[PDB]
Ligand binder design. Sequence first.
Ligand SMILES: OC[C@H]1O[C@H](O[C@H]2[C@H](O)[C@@H](O)[C@@H](O[C@H]3[C@H](O)[C@@H](O)[C@@H](O[C@H]4[C@H](O)[C@@H](O)[C@@H](O[C@H]5[C@H](O)[C@@H](O)[C@@H](O[C@H]6[C@H](O)[C@@H](O)[C@H](O)O[C@@H]6CO)O[C@@H]5CO)O[C@@H]4CO)O[C@@H]3CO)O[C@@H]2CO)[C@H](O)[C@@H](O)[C@@H]1O
Ligand SMILES: OC[C@H]1O[C@H](O[C@H]2[C@H](O)[C@@H](O)[C@@H](O[C@H]3[C@H](O)[C@@H](O)[C@@H](O[C@H]4[C@H](O)[C@@H](O)[C@@H](O[C@H]5[C@H](O)[C@@H](O)[C@@H](O)O[C@@H]5CO)O[C@@H]4CO)O[C@@H]3CO)O[C@@H]2CO)[C@H](O)[C@@H](O)[C@@H]1O
Ligand SMILES: OC[C@H]1O[C@H](O[C@H]2[C@H](O)[C@@H](O)[C@@H](O[C@H]3[C@H](O)[C@@H](O)[C@@H](O)O[C@@H]3CO)O[C@@H]2CO)[C@H](O)[C@@H](O)[C@@H]1O
Ligand SMILES: Nc1ncnc2c1ncn2[C@@H]1O[C@H](COP(=O)(O)OP(=O)(O)O)[C@@H](O)[C@H]1O
Ligand SMILES: OC[C@H]1O[C@H](O[C@H]2[C@H](O)[C@@H](O)[C@@H](O)O[C@@H]2CO)[C@H](O)[C@@H](O)[C@@H]1O
Ligand SMILES: O=S(=O)(O)C[C@H](O)CN1CCN(CCO)CC1
Ligand code: NA
Ligand code: NA
Length: 476
Amino acid sequence: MQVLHVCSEMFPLLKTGGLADVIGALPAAQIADGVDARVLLPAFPDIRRGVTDAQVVSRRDTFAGHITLLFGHYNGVGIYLIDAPHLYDRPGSPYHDTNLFAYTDNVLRFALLGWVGAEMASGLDPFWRPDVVHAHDWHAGLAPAYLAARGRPAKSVFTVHNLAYQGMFYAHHMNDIQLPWSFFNIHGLEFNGQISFLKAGLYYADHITAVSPTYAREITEPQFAYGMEGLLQQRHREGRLSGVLNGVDEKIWSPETDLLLASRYTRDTLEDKAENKRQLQIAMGLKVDDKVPLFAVVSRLTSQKGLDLVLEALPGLLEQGGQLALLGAGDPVLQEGFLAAAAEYPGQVGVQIGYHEAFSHRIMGGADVILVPSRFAPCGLTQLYGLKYGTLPLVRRTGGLADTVSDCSLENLADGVASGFVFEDSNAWSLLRAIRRAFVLWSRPSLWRFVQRQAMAMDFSWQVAAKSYRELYYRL
Ligand SMILES: OC[C@H]1O[C@H](O[C@H]2[C@H](O)[C@@H](O)[C@@H](O[C@H]3[C@H](O)[C@@H](O)[C@@H](O[C@H]4[C@H](O)[C@@H](O)[C@@H](O[C@H]5[C@H](O)[C@@H](O)[C@@H](O[C@H]6[C@H](O)[C@@H](O)[C@H](O)O[C@@H]6CO)O[C@@H]5CO)O[C@@H]4CO)O[C@@H]3CO)O[C@@H]2CO)[C@H](O)[C@@H](O)[C@@H]1O
Ligand SMILES: OC[C@H]1O[C@H](O[C@H]2[C@H](O)[C@@H](O)[C@@H](O[C@H]3[C@H](O)[C@@H](O)[C@@H](O[C@H]4[C@H](O)[C@@H](O)[C@@H](O[C@H]5[C@H](O)[C@@H](O)[C@@H](O)O[C@@H]5CO)O[C@@H]4CO)O[C@@H]3CO)O[C@@H]2CO)[C@H](O)[C@@H](O)[C@@H]1O
Ligand SMILES: OC[C@H]1O[C@H](O[C@H]2[C@H](O)[C@@H](O)[C@@H](O[C@H]3[C@H](O)[C@@H](O)[C@@H](O)O[C@@H]3CO)O[C@@H]2CO)[C@H](O)[C@@H](O)[C@@H]1O
Ligand SMILES: Nc1ncnc2c1ncn2[C@@H]1O[C@H](COP(=O)(O)OP(=O)(O)O)[C@@H](O)[C@H]1O
Ligand SMILES: OC[C@H]1O[C@H](O[C@H]2[C@H](O)[C@@H](O)[C@@H](O)O[C@@H]2CO)[C@H](O)[C@@H](O)[C@@H]1O
Ligand SMILES: O=S(=O)(O)C[C@H](O)CN1CCN(CCO)CC1
Ligand code: NA
Ligand code: NA
């Protein structure tokens, strides 16, 4: 069984969020579990730099101009690179410029990614053809469309990591992407008068998955589907929609072996976590104090994440005696909001605006609680990281957060299953109740420790996930 993942990022070469973590860890797991998995990526500069054994497979002309298909290895896994400097040789985000504007040629940049994915099924590499093309998010949404247009020389799976990003482009681009004009149709890739790459992925794939079981249910509802729910409801009925929960990469996210930490520690040596907390406090300029709970954020600042609620709840949290340590980049409204708060409450609020890979580890390793108040959550990895690190996640009960965290309710404590704090509604009052719950647990240190150990017993294995994907692949 040969599978090609078609996507636009991969840890550690290029990462803007959780997607890259998946692509960086799933293929290796699949290989261990008996699937021959390779990855197709655009040759963004950081990716091209990391693959040092890249060889030429092929040159082709294309609706988007010429490509050199390269192939090499990263961390044991076979990586194809689409080298097209005129599209991909630019620094920064794969999706937008410095000023945060989407590239105006995105339709071509990402249509090409989908086209090469499909072309791979027809022998673009003379030495290896995938049986299944596995496309990820809107970026790769056209891959199943190109496959359909060519009589499905391979089966296709489309997985949604996020339904809010739709890959909308004006209809006139049907002229630019070499698909049948008849594909522009509610029964096809049209979506409210435009082209949608997400719609294309959802419509044309043999099978759709979402990155958690409850998000797979949620996206059949108007609240989480943003107009797409009818397709998803229909695909559910056809048995063509399912959820497979993400794992965590243990090579990189384990306090037991984490080389980025001041101090490594284990589920049975949580005393060794304290030095991380002290150095985190020092690093952020917080009062060095171990009697006080340190709450943390490591998050893209976008609407999805509910961080406005954190801002509203901040006074309440501070009033109860908590500290906050925040790392994130996105909306300036949010950015300015938090910078202001750190100015207003020095020694209590530490903030760092920007993307810092190593610093997120030091936060995860030193904080007591990780705040994930998301409005929606296809899966969420940072809460999984909190669990592994004994950093209790405080989450909204939605999507993968609902699949993965157990509230410290009386039943859950009594059954030995409690692992964090859960609130229901997207408002600060709801958030604040969960925060109070945390303060109550914090005043019973042995109960806190009992919940940490249970959080750290939770297992999120990629090889276990690989097994589900494999069953899926064989049943197509
Ligand atoms: O894609 C298959 C899927 O479609 C619906 O689910 C969602 C859809 O995928 C999504 O794109 C969006 O649809 C909006 C669309 O983008 C807009 O263009 C507009 O749709 C209008 C159409 O453009 C227009 O052609 C016409 O549609 C008629 C169809 O052409 C016709 O074939 C017929 O199809 C119906 C089938 O008979 C029925 O079995 C099927 O389940 O539902 C179809 C009806 O939608 O009838 C159509 C209606 O006359 O008018 C359209 C309505 O103005 O607006 C669209 C809705 O906002 O959102 C969709 C819902 O989330 C279907 O719900 C889903 O069943 C199907 O699998
Ligand atoms: O210069 C001499 C050489 O030149 C040309 O080969 C080049 C190819 O034309 C070009 O495509 C590229 O080859 C890539 C290949 O496309 C890519 O798929 C990958 O090949 C993998 C196989 O996919 C994989 O199956 C495995 O092959 C095994 C094979 O299973 C086994 O039966 C036995 O043959 O051992 C093989 C090698 O272990 O591994 C290979 C290698 O990873 O990578 C290829 C190499 O980069 O680049 C080629 C060399 O530059 C000519 O076409 C060729 O005939 C000439 O001999
Ligand atoms: O790995 C994290 C995240 O990456 C992917 O999301 C990207 C979107 O697909 C992409 O459109 C882009 O969205 C941003 C716009 O470019 C920007 O103009 C502004 O609108 O903010 C948008 C939202 O952030 O950037 C993100 C990169 O994070 C992927 O699809 C997600 O599943 C994934 O979780
Ligand atoms: N500002 C940041 N600095 C460093 N890492 C970040 C930052 N923001 C997010 N991350 C990382 O990105 C990933 C986010 O994954 P996830 O929680 O699934 O959410 P999403 O995919 O929606 O971004 C995590 O590895 C997280 O640590
Ligand atoms: O996401 C912003 C914007 O994207 C699309 O507009 C494209 C357009 O399709 C291209 O032809 C060109 O003008 O560049 C734009 C950005 O990539 C959507 O069509 C539009 O609705 C959306 O707001
Ligand atoms: O992120 S939020 O949940 O707070 C807001 C919604 O996700 C806004 N969406 C839904 C789909 N979009 C198109 C507008 O319907 C843009 C992202
Ligand atoms: Na999935
Ligand atoms: Na994030």
